[PDB]
Amino acid sequence: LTPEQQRYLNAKKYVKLFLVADYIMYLKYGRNLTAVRTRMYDIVNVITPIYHRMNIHVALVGLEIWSNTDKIIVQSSADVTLDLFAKWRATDLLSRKSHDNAQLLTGINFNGPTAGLGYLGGICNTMYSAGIVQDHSKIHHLVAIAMAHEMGHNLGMDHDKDTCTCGTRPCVMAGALSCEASFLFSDCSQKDHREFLIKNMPQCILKKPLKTDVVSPAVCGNYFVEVGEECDCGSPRTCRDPCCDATTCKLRQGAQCAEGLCCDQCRFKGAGTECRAAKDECDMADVCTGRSAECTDRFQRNGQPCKNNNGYCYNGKCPIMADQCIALFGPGATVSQDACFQFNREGNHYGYCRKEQNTKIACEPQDVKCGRLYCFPNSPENKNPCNIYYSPNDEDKGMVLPGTKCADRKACSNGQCVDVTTP
Amino acid sequence: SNLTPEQQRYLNAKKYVKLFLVADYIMYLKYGRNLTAVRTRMYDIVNVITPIYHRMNIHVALVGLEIWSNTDKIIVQSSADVTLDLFAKWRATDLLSRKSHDNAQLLTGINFNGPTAGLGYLGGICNTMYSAGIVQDHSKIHHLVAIAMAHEMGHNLGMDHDKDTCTCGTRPCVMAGALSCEASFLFSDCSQKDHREFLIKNMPQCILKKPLKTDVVSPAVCGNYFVEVGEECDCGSPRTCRDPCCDATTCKLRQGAQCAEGLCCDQCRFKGAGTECRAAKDECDMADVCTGRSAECTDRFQRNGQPCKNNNGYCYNGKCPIMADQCIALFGPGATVSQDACFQFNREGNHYGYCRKEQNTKIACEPQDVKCGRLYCFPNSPENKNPCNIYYSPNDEDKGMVLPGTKCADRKACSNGQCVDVTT
Numbered sequence: 001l002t003p004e005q006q007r008y009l010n011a012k013k014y015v016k017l018f019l020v021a022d023y024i025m026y027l028k029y030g031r032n033l034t035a036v037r038t039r040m041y042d043i044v045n046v047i048t049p050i051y052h053r054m055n056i057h058v059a060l061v062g063l064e065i066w067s068n069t070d071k072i073i074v075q076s077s078a079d080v081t082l083d084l085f086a087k088w089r090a091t092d093l094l095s096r097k098s099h100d101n102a103q104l105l106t107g108i109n110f111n112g113p114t115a116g117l118g119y120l121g122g123i124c125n126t127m128y129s130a131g132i133v134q135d136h137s138k139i140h141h142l143v144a145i146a147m148a149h150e151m152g153h154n155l156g157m158d159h160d161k162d163t164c165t166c167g168t169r170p171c172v173m174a175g176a177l178s179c180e181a182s183f184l185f186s187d188c189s190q191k192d193h194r195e196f197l198i199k200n201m202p203q204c205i206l207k208k209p210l211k212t213d214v215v216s217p218a219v220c221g222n223y224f225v226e227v228g229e230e231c232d233c234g235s236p237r238t239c240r241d242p243c244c245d246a247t248t249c250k251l252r253q254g255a256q257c258a259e260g261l262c263c264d265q266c267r268f269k270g271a272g273t274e275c276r277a278a279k280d281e282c283d284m285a286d287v288c289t290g291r292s293a294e295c296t297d298r299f300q301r302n303g304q305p306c307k308n309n310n311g312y313c314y315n316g317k318c319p320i321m322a323d324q325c326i327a328l329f330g331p332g333a334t335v336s337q338d339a340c341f342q343f344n345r346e347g348n349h350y351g352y353c354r355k356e357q358n359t360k361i362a363c364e365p366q367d368v369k370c371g372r373l374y375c376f377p378n379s380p381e382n383k384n385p386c387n388i389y390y391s392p393n394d395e396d397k398g399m400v401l402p403g404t405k406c407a408d409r410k411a412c413s414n415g416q417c418v419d420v421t422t423p
Numbered sequence: 424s425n426l427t428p429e430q431q432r433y434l435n436a437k438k439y440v441k442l443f444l445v446a447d448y449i450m451y452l453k454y455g456r457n458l459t460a461v462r463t464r465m466y467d468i469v470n471v472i473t474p475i476y477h478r479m480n481i482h483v484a485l486v487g488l489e490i491w492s493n494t495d496k497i498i499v500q501s502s503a504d505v506t507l508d509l510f511a512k513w514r515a516t517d518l519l520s521r522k523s524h525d526n527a528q529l530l531t532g533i534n535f536n537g538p539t540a541g542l543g544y545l546g547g548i549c550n551t552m553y554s555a556g557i558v559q560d561h562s563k564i565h566h567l568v569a570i571a572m573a574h575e576m577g578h579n580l581g582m583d584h585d586k587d588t589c590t591c592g593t594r595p596c597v598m599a600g601a602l603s604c605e606a607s608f609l610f611s612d613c614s615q616k617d618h619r620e621f622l623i624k625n626m627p628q629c630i631l632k633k634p635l636k637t638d639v640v641s642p643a644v645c646g647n648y649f650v651e652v653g654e655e656c657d658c659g660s661p662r663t664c665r666d667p668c669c670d671a672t673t674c675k676l677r678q679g680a681q682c683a684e685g686l687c688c689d690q691c692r693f694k695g696a697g698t699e700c701r702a703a704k705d706e707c708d709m710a711d712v713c714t715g716r717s718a719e720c721t722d723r724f725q726r727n728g729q730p731c732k733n734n735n736g737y738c739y740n741g742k743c744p745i746m747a748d749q750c751i752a753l754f755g756p757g758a759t760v761s762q763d764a765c766f767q768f769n770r771e772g773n774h775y776g777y778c779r780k781e782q783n784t785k786i787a788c789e790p791q792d793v794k795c796g797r798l799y800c801f802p803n804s805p806e807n808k809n810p811c812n813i814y815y816s817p818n819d820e821d822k823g824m825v826l827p828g829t830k831c832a833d834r835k836a837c838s839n840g841q842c843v844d845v846t847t
């Protein structure tokens with residue numbers, strides 16, 4: 001592995017789940033919205049500890065009930081419904097509520113013995129981080145396991161086969177519905193999922209949700225501080241935090257904090273102390289305010305020469321045209337010769353500098369290095385020296401990232417090559 | 424501790440539960456607004472319930488099914504108690520007037536409050552107000568829903584929940600009091616015990632009546648021990664069938680067999696013509712003989728008019744209806760027929776005293792037809808002070824009227840509000 005891979009695997013995971021309940025669910029629970037939410041909370045309350053054994057904390061960030069009419073056409077075909085649900089999420093849900101993954105809890109019966117369906121490895125994706133689960137049984141922990149199963153597939157896991165085991169009982173990723181299903185993941189799932197994160201490093205599961213963005217009732221002992229709680233270190237038997245009274249999820253007497261790089265023996269660290277040290281050339285070691293328990297990640301002032309003077313620090317990162325190119329057209333790609341950027345002087349369709357409202361502005365002679373990026377899909381053959389990455393859905397994609405080095409001591413700001421405001 | 428003869432006879436008779444099933448609006452939506460998928464689901468369930476009850480000397484037969492696909496006929500709610508009550512009441516006022524049946528179960532896709540997944544009246548079997556149950560289509564696995572349904576029918580059939588000491592083996596039993604998934608298809612000894620006692624004590628008559636093959640609306644299933652349309656015989660599975668006249672695989676009579684069952688069937692062949700198949704059970708009955716062309720034994724009686732019960736009355740379609748008996752059937756033991764004078768109130772054509780209804784009016788009796796109107800009885804209570812006492816129902820004004828073929832005069836019996844002459 002690499003320094004970034006292993007560093008990622010270590011980071012605590014979080015799945016900001018958005019749950020949707022269809023019109024059949026609303027009817028199923030006697031047209032009582034509270035009853036439908038309580039059902040979803042019960043389900044999440046089971047999913048959460050299940051995913052703790054996988055270094056993931058499922059947090060309910062959104063909830064919606066189609067008590068008026070379904071936003072899509074929920075149907076017997078699991079395939080059609082899933083497709084319809086994902087798209088609706090991509091185009092309607094995400095636009096008004098950010099979240100990492102959505103699950104449709106429907107009361108309809110899917111054709112066949114299947115109780116759910118989901119996109120393999122679609123986690124975090126704006127178009128595929130979705131799954132559908134049939135509220136197939138009165139016993140909610142079984143519905144919970146099914147949803148955890150679909151979430152599993154989203155997380156790169158495949159059905160358990162031959163050798164795979166987790167004990168004397170079926171595991172979450174078992175191929176079919178078994179009422180003896182346990183809450184454990186098999187070694188195989190452990191592995192396939194490990195590999196999966198190693199291969200794609202989905203960024204959205206690193207963001208811990210604010211304790212105020214989590215809409216499910218607080219659960220003391222689920223390893224996550226929620227509204228109404230000062231700390232959560234698990235049950236009293238497993239709680240290792242001496243600052244936390246595990247029984248009440250409240251700080252013990254005399255404690256100001258429990259966790260944080262700015263907490264120490266239940267007390268804030270002195271205003272001045274250093275909590276997090278710089279991770280790279282563009283990051284800067286942080287300090288505690290003596291007042292808060294948290295450590296704000298401050299970065300090295302933007303415009304700081306970085307990556308062997310091939311760019312400049314921009315909010316903790318070092319944007320480089322070369323990286324952008326290899327990121328847009330894969331390995332081997334290189335930045336197009338300078339003459340190619342003259343195409344940004346057209347303000348035509350793909351070549352322009354910025355957007356007033358929706359109207360494209362052409363790059364002035366000195367700003368061509370800040371409009372559309374030009375690369376050379378490196379096959380030494382490729383005759384055409386200029387190539388761009390364009391998207392109809394979002395025209396910004398393919399433009400030179402802000403803060404990108406466009407000349408000595410110069411980086412793009414808003415479609416303009418301007419001098420670093422640093423020495 | 425002892426067991427009467429009629430009890431033993433009752434216990435031995437084959438039992439049938441003519442079942443009516445109703446699926447609600449949520450079921451309709453749940454299975455994609457597809458009527459076929461909903462019916463198939465119900466057939467599947469019944470295909471599981473039937474073998475569960477055969478072990479109890481009962482054949483469950485689906486004689487009706489209704490899917491509330493437009494709107495629910497009652498307000499199906501999350502409270503099982505309300506729903507059951509609304510369902511039984513709708514069965515009584517609406518369904519029973521449209522199709523006769525022994526028991527109805529509501530299969531809803533709604534979730535009942537709490538852990539319960541069904542509710543039904545204890546010992547309500549055959550009762551026009553209480554033979555009902557409701558069940559949640561609580562699991563994708565239909566055989567579990569079937570078990571839930573057999574549990575409620577179980578309660579209707581007088582069984583209670585299994586106490587911790589009750590067993591039927593390893594797995595939990597049908598009457599287990601809690602919704603579980605290891606659920607087996609067998610009744611625990613406690614259930615079998617409670618069921619027997621229930622039967623002995625109440626002898627519910629409706630489950631003695633076999634439904635016609637054409638009354639069954641569920642697709643025929645060869646091997647369920649019941650001869651359905653398209654079948655000629657059914658002795659169960661091939662590997663367990665012992666009836667030699669039947670091909671347990673095609674439910675067709677074996678080559679060379681004319682029949683498989685019947686009072687007039689013997690060793691797979693029709694009994695000889697004139698062979699007696701049913702002795703007379705009483706004076707108004709006539710022994711019956713086979714035809715040699717059928718396995719059935721048509722039951723006929725003496726001709727309507729022959730004296731009976733010591734000149735009490737005259738045989739009417741196999742029975743001897745006499746006022747004395749009717750007075751006891753309506754008011755209980757001790758009840759006696761009223762003094763002739765009492766029947767005079769039939770001469771007023773009033774609200775309860777008449778002889779018959781012409782169009783919808785009430786034709787009073789003529790002095791001669793005074794004993795073919797409202798039956799007048801009077802109980803043996805010493806504190807009773809009334810000579811004439813009538814039985815009446817707003818629902819059926821006909822109820823409590825003298826029964827057909829009842830001896831009103833000497834050689835005369837009631838036919839229609841008129842004390843006609845016997846010989847007719």
Ligand SMILES: *[C@@H]1O[C@H](CO)[C@@H](O[C@@H]2O[C@H](CO)[C@@H](O)[C@H](O)[C@H]2NC(C)=O)[C@H](O)[C@H]1NC(C)=O
Nearest residue numbers: 076111454455456457458459460461462463464
């Ligand atoms: C209504 O639902 C029924 C399910 O019972 C569907 O019929 C099944 O269709 C599949 C197609 O592969 C067959 O294999 C089954 O044998 C059918 N079942 C029976 C017994 O009919 C039917 O397709 C649905 N109708 C509509 C309009 O979708």
Ligand SMILES: *[C@@H]1O[C@H](CO)[C@@H](O)[C@H](O)[C@H]1NC(C)=O
Nearest residue numbers: 030032033034035036038501
């Ligand atoms: C709605 O459901 C909630 C939670 O199950 C319950 O507490 C409440 O009483 C219900 N409302 C009614 C009266 O149906």
Ligand SMILES: [Ca+2]
Nearest residue numbers: 219220224232
């Ligand atoms: Ca908590």
Ligand SMILES: [Ca+2]
Nearest residue numbers: 284297298299
């Ligand atoms: Ca920092």
Ligand SMILES: [Ca+2]
Nearest residue numbers: 644645649657
């Ligand atoms: Ca049959």
Ligand SMILES: [Ca+2]
Nearest residue numbers: 709722723724
């Ligand atoms: Ca006879």
Ligand SMILES: [Zn+2]
Nearest residue numbers: 149153159175
């Ligand atoms: Zn799966």
Ligand SMILES: [Zn+2]
Nearest residue numbers: 574578584600
């Ligand atoms: Zn019960």
